[PDB]
């Protein structure tokens, strides 16, 4: 009984991902988000441990929703005749990182360091759980404004993590790496690092560096905002044209620009409250 366990509120948004409503769990007034996806629009299908055929998004969410993390957790899901309904955590109050950056402009490096660190921890958690997100971008990051915590959303373009080559991609092209643009081939971790370089530039400059295929493969990074040499170095390393020249997640988090990160609570008090 989906309609009796949750009170459905206003529409929060819709797009390639489906339609997402605000909701409240009737059992305990927990804020939730209620995401509807039409079956005919679902390209990638998978199998839960039980064997029931579900959208891949459900498989991946279940793999990463165990325990606490910087990933928006799947609380429950329902199958309807023509759709699946996903019940997801809802931070309150909340704003996605795209809107935050539009409103604030380029972020102070201290704030970008805190946000970027938390995204790295969230992506490491996904990879630890065998999940590749494949659509890391500011639009797919939510900010819990009171707690100063970032939450990754939308595994609708994701895949099981593997060590062999990927030849399919349905994420966001302006965050996709030059080897995808040029050859329609990429490896999961090095492609993720590229998208993180795009995201970090986006945070400290106020918008992404590349809009066109020619810019993505040209690999020239122009800084439109004052950015420290240490931060520039990390961005340019993540955006290396050759995938094997990009840092590992360990090398990113050991980079000099990443040290002395604020705690999430400190981040909220200094920058969000």
């Amino acid at each position: 009984p989906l309609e009796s366990q949750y009170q459905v509120g206003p529409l929060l948004g819709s797009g390639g991902f489906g339609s997402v409503y605000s909701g409240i769990r009737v059992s305990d007034n927990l804020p939730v988000a209620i995401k509807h996806v039409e079956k005919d629009r679902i390209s990638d299908w998978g199998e839960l441990p039980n064997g029931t055929r579900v959208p891949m998004e459900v498989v991946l969410l279940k793999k990463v929703s165990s325990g606490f993390s910087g990933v928006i957790r799947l609380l429950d899901w329902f199958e309807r005749p023509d759709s699946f309904v996903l019940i997801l955590e809802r931070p309150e109050p909340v704003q996605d990182l795209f809107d935050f950056i539009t409103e604030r402009g380029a972020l102070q490096e201290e704030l970008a360091r805190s946000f970027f660190w938390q995204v790295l921890e969230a992506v490491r958690h996904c990879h630890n759980c065998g999940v590749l997100h494949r659509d890391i971008k500011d639009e797919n990051i939510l900010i819990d404004l009171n707690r100063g915590e970032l939450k990754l959303i939308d595994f609708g373009s994701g895949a099981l993590l593997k060590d062999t080559v990927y030849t399919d991609f349905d994420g966001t092209r302006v965050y996709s790496p030059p080897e995808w643009i040029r050859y329609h081939r990429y490896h999961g971790r090095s492609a993720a690092v590229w998208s993180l370089g795009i995201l970090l530039y986006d945070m400290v400059c106020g918008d992404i560096p590349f809009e066109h295929d020619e810019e993505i493969i040209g690999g020239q990074v122009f800084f439109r905002q004052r950015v420290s040499s240490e931060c520039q170095h990390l961005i340019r390393w993540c955006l290396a044209l050759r995938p094997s020249d990009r840092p590992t997640f360990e090398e990113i988090q050991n980079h000099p620009w990443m040290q002395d990160v604020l705690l999430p609570q400190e981040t909220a008090e200094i920058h969000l409250h």
């Binding site: 659509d135 349905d170 966001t172």
Partner: peptide, 9 residues
Amino acid sequence: RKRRRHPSG
């Protein structure tokens, strides 16, 4: 230039 969202796919 204008900042814009970019749909997946």
